[PDB]
Structure 1
Amino acid sequence: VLTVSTVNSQVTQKPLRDSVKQALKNYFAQLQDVNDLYELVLAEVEQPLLDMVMQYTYGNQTRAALMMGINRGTLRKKLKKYGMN
């Protein structure tokens, strides 16, 4: 269960989606028109995911793709997309 630790005014522990809700919330007030919010968020999440995965598997695509649950082709598509290849 993906969770994130944090420190409040005085330390705490909420799921990942919360951080997402906050960023989205914060983002809206930041406006004054959006048109590619999806791809925008995906990228802000796929890359860190890729890093963590690739880091674990010492860049071993195969062993990495097997972890995320996707085929090598796709993985390569994303890496190349985020220029990590």
Structure 2
Amino acid sequence: VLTVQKPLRDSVKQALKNYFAQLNGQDVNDLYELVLAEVEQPLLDMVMQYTRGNQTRAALMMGINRGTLRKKLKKYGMN
């Protein structure tokens, strides 16, 4: 699970390689959150679409609590 024939982890890896290549003595101190934003957003979007906006169902599918789910939606301004 989490394929795009090639696993999702391989794409992440590739994206990081490309990014590192663009650094050139340029600092970075928010990599974790930067990658996270890139991933959480589409994840939330997709789950919501899947459950047709039902937050309870979306949270149960993700294994997080409803409150945390709403907190993440807010964080990304997804309401």
The SS at the match of 1:34 is: coil
Q: Which runs of 5+ in 1 are unaligned?
A: 1-10
Q: Rate the CA distance shift 1:12–1:77 in 2: closer, same or farther, 3 A.
A: closer
TM-score where L is the length of structure 2: 0.90
Q: CA deviation at 1:26?
A: 0.4
- Confirm whether residue 12 of structure 1 aligns to residue 4 of structure 2: yes
Q: CA deviation at 1:39?
A: 0.2
Q: Runs of 4 or more off by more than 3 Å in structure 1? A: none
Q: Which runs of 5+ in 2 are unaligned?
A: none
| Residue number in structure 2 paired with 1:51 | 45
Q: Rate the CA distance shift 1:12–1:67 in 2: closer, same or farther, 3 A.
A: closer
Q: Distance in 1 between matches of 2:55 and 2:75?
A: 15
Structure with more strand by fraction:
1
Q: CA deviation at 1:79?
A: 0.2
Q: CA deviation at 1:13?
A: 1.7
Q: Distance in 2 between matches of 1:20 and 1:12?
A: 11
Q: Rate the CA distance shift 1:38–1:12 in 2: closer, same or farther, 3 A.
A: closer
Question: Percent sequence identity over matched residues?
Answer: 96
TM-score where L is the length of structure 1: 0.84
* Cα-to-partner distance string for 1:45-65 (whole Å, 9 max, x where unaligned): 000000110000111000100
Task: Compute the RMSD of aligned alpha carbons.
Answer: 1.9
- Confirm whether residue 83 of structure 1 aligns to residue 65 of structure 2: no
